[PDB]
């Protein structure tokens, strides 16, 4: 290894409750004012970021909402669910203006392209599908994977689409041609999560064996972030270099991206009346500053984490230990 950059501890500071089913998705508005959250109660809840107050609950999915993205360039929120629907919510009317139909089974994730008017969506049907945001046309179907596609993330340069699957592969896609120009086989188990580093040309992906870092655009393997032996199903990368990987058992490890050193291991507590089997984390997001981590939980709460303001290197030391 090499020298970790030091990162402050994160502490729990808010617990919003009000979903009646598992909170499956979270995303933060570009201006950082509010975050949406879908859940297994088939309702999308919009919450104020600074005060936690529930602005609005948007209802309209037939079953569990489990992808939610706020468009960086449009006044739109996109969401998909186990009912195979993908929906565009016009936030200037709080109404579903568009549907994207073609998925054959549950929509697992969706990602909204940072500079095109393009939306990509995963499903259990082992496809990622690319949508024209305007005309709802299915500009591509990425029929590469052989088991359900669990995550997708978009970026402006090639590979514009990266996809993770339960076949334990990650694939890099040519979005112009619509063909996978790389397959990263290194995971032993289902790859449920992806994150792209917001300021390095590098991305990460999680599976119960290992989180792996990858240099883009070729996707060559950098290093494992080893030892988080749980069904990891979220990855969030901070702007400063923290990465965090919440897991199905409700544990919540934070890592230095640069060294891979796991500096903190939170274990989440189920909120009252929930069973110890409900500790799990189903999604996480950073706020746009990168100083509030929002996590979505199997206990139907939304928990929020904040850097400990008073920590300093000499309070929480890192040595060298290669």
């Amino acid at each position: 290894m090499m020298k970790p950059k030091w990162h402050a501890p994160w502490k729990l500071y808010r617990v919003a409750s009000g979903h009646t089913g598992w909170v499956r998705a979270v995303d933060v508005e570009p201006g950082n004012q509010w975050f949406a959250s879908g859940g297994a109660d088939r309702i999308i809840k919009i919450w104020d970021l600074a005060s936690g107050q529930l602005k609005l609950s948007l209802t309209g999915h037939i079953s569990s909402v489990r992808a939610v993205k706020v468009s960086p360039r449009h006044p739109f929120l996109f969401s998909g669910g186990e009912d195979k629907q993908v929906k565009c919510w016009d936030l200037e009317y709080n109404k579903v203006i568009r549907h994207y139909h073609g998925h054959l089974s549950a929509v697992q994730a969706l990602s909204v392209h940072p500079s095109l008017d393009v939306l990509v969506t995963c499903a259990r049907d082992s496809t990622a599908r690319v949508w024209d945001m305007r005309t709802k046309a299915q500009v591509h179907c990425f029929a590469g994977h052989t088991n359900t596609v669990a995550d997708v993330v978009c970026q402006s340069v090639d590979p514009q689409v990266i996809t993770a699957s339960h076949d334990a592969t990650v694939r890099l896609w040519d979005l112009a041609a619509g063909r996978s120009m790389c397959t990263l086989t290194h995971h032993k188990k289902s790859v449920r999560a992806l994150t792209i580093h917001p300021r390095l040309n590098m991305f990460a992906s999680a599976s119960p064996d290992n989180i792996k870092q990858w240099k883009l655009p070729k996707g060559e393997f950098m290093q494992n972030l080893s030892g988080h032996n749980a069904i990891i199903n979220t990855l969030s990368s901070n702007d400063d270099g923290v990465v965090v990987s919440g897991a199905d058992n409700g544990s919540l490890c934070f890592w230095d991206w640069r060294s891979g050193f796991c500096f903190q291991k939170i274990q989440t507590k189920p909120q009252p009346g929930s069973i110890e089997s409900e500790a799990g984390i189903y999604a996480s997001c950073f706020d746009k500053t990168g100083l509030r981590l929002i996590t979505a939980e199997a206990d139907k709460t939304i928990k929020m984490y904040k850097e400990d303001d008073e920590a300093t290197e000499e309070s929480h030391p890192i040595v060298w230990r290669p």
């Binding site: 397959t183 032993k188 240099k215 950098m222």
Partner: protein, 179 residues
Amino acid sequence: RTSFRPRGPEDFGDGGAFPEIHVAQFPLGLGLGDMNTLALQYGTDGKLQHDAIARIGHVKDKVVYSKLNDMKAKTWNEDDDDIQKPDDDAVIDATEKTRMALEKIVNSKVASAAQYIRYTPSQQNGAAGSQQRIIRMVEEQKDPMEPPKFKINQKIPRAPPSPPAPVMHSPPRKMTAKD
């Protein structure tokens, strides 16, 4: 050597045929027989490319991942050059290039539901005395009142997947019978 003649493959030694000896020289099997299987080959790193099998049937795509040293860990706290994000010029150039590339799909998808050609034929017996033809290609007028011409309710198996990417795992971790 001009007094000498080879005749057996061993007579040349390790060298090739002799141009000063005007006899038909076959320093190995070369030229004795007559002219499905790719040939094993050294790479530019001097290793032997047994994993050339993994490259058959691909469009020269990036999945050359077939060596252990591409599965071993690489630099930690990387050298800040390749790892830097692409610049604004790159994201702009990529956006426009990809935009117009998929515009051609969607416009041709929502529409789904003089000019000449100079031709240089290879069959040079040809048009009379001419290395080249030149032809006016008109477009035949479609009748707007004519319905779709052909059945397309056909269904056929998917194209087979692109050949297997090598599996590239960490070695197995031994299960005890306790596990």
